[PDB]
Amino acid sequence: GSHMASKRALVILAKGAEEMETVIPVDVMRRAGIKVTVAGLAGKDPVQCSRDVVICPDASLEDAKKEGPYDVVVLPGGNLGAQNLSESAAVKEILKEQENRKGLIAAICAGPTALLAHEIGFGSKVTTHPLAKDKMMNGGHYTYSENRVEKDGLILTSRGPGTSFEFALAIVEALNGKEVAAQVKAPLVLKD
Amino acid sequence: GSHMASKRALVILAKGAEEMETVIPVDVMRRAGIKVTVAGLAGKDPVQCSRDVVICPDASLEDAKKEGPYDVVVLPGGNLGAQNLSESAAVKEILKEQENRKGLIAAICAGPTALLAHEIGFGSKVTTHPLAKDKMMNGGHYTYSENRVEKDGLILTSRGPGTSFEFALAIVEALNGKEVAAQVKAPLVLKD
Numbered sequence: 001g002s003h004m005a006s007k008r009a010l011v012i013l014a015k016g017a018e019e020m021e022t023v024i025p026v027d028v029m030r031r032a033g034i035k036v037t038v039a040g041l042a043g044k045d046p047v048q049c050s051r052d053v054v055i056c057p058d059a060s061l062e063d064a065k066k067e068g069p070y071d072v073v074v075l076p077g078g079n080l081g082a083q084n085l086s087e088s089a090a091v092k093e094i095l096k097e098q099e100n101r102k103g104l105i106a107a108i109c110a111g112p113t114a115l116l117a118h119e120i121g122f123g124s125k126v127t128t129h130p131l132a133k134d135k136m137m138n139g140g141h142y143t144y145s146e147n148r149v150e151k152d153g154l155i156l157t158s159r160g161p162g163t164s165f166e167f168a169l170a171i172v173e174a175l176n177g178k179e180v181a182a183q184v185k186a187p188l189v190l191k192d
Numbered sequence: 193g194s195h196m197a198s199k200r201a202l203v204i205l206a207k208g209a210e211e212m213e214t215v216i217p218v219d220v221m222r223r224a225g226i227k228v229t230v231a232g233l234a235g236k237d238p239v240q241c242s243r244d245v246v247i248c249p250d251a252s253l254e255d256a257k258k259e260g261p262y263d264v265v266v267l268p269g270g271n272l273g274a275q276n277l278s279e280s281a282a283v284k285e286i287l288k289e290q291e292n293r294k295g296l297i298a299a300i301c302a303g304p305t306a307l308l309a310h311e312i313g314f315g316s317k318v319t320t321h322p323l324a325k326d327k328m329m330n331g332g333h334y335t336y337s338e339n340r341v342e343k344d345g346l347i348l349t350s351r352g353p354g355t356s357f358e359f360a361l362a363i364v365e366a367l368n369g370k371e372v373a374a375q376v377k378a379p380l381v382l383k384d
Binding site for chain 2: 018019020023024026027030031038046050051052053054055056129130131148159160161162163165187188189190191192
């Protein structure tokens with residue numbers, strides 16, 4: 001088939017999500033030609049984010065899950081957002097399915113703490129926001145990294161709003177390769 | 193009165209705006225304690241941005257203008273977004289009023305081209321996205337800068353998505369000072 005596969009991403013958007021950590025990966029992945037579904041945890045209604053920006057999802061999570069599978073599942077941060085992701089049985093089921101089929105799981109800042117809650121990726125090397133490290137490491141189920149972006153097999157993690165572009169480009173590289181990532185980076189006017 | 197003045201920002205959101213360039217300044221300014229109104233150019237309905245993220249405004253521009261004045265008016269980029277800002281008589285009137293009262297005007301990437309359209313700040317030093325330089329400099333009404341963030345009196349400009357955090361922190365510094373900007377920067381995990 002075609003040497004230019006179209007890839008698909010699911011971004012799970014819960015109330016209290018960090019809006020920068022949501023929008024930056026969505027925009028950069030769409031620039032790369034990835035088909036991105038922004039799915040609302042609670043349905044299709046607009047989602048109030050951590051600093052009160054209101055984002056309209058593309059679909060409910062209920063409907064997006066039926067249209068899987070996805071090449072990457074993306075978990076933004078935000079304290080309340082990650083708590084809501086951690087309490088959701090629907091998120092549990094999507095992540096376990098993604099782990100079983102050897103799909104990529106990407107999470108940033110407090111987002112990785114939802115991996116702990118759902119028992120995803122134990123034994124992996126992960127990073128988090130510094131303020132979330134103690135939560136993530138309770139029980140010693142992971143190895144901690146201070147790298148701005150960390151990738152250990154199919155678990156890709158990153159630290160904070162200021163690492164969001166690096167995180168998004170790492171997803172693009174993993175899915176579509178280094179050359180597409182270089183294309184997308186070129187007009188962004190990143191520092192390095 | 194209080195040595196801790198509350199400041200106010202107006203962010204004008206038009207169809208086709210760059211969603212990263214919209215959300216990053218809104219979030220960072222709210223982290224700083226600035227009261228931010230995201231005003232929809234076309235009314236209060238949801239706005240489709242350049243990479244199809246849909247943002248709900250806080251208010252219509254019609255209503256937000258009545259609740260002025262604002263300490264800063266912020267113009268995001270995005271090609272279509274900046275075109276819509278350039279064609280709007282309501283934007284003209286807000287910017288001219290802001291210039292007359294010596295208020296800050298901040299614009300990023302293609303956003304500065306709306307200053308040219310509305311004859312704002314002629315003679316100032318400005319930057320833009322590299323791809324917008326020729327448009328901005330048609331007629332020689334400005335001096336061009338390649339700095340990532342440029343501030344010339346009350347005109348603050350910046351280059352692209354990757355300079356958005358720098359741009360937002362420059363707004364915070366101008367409004368609330370260096371110490372508040374240092375507070376807001378601390379948990380962002382910026383490279384430098």
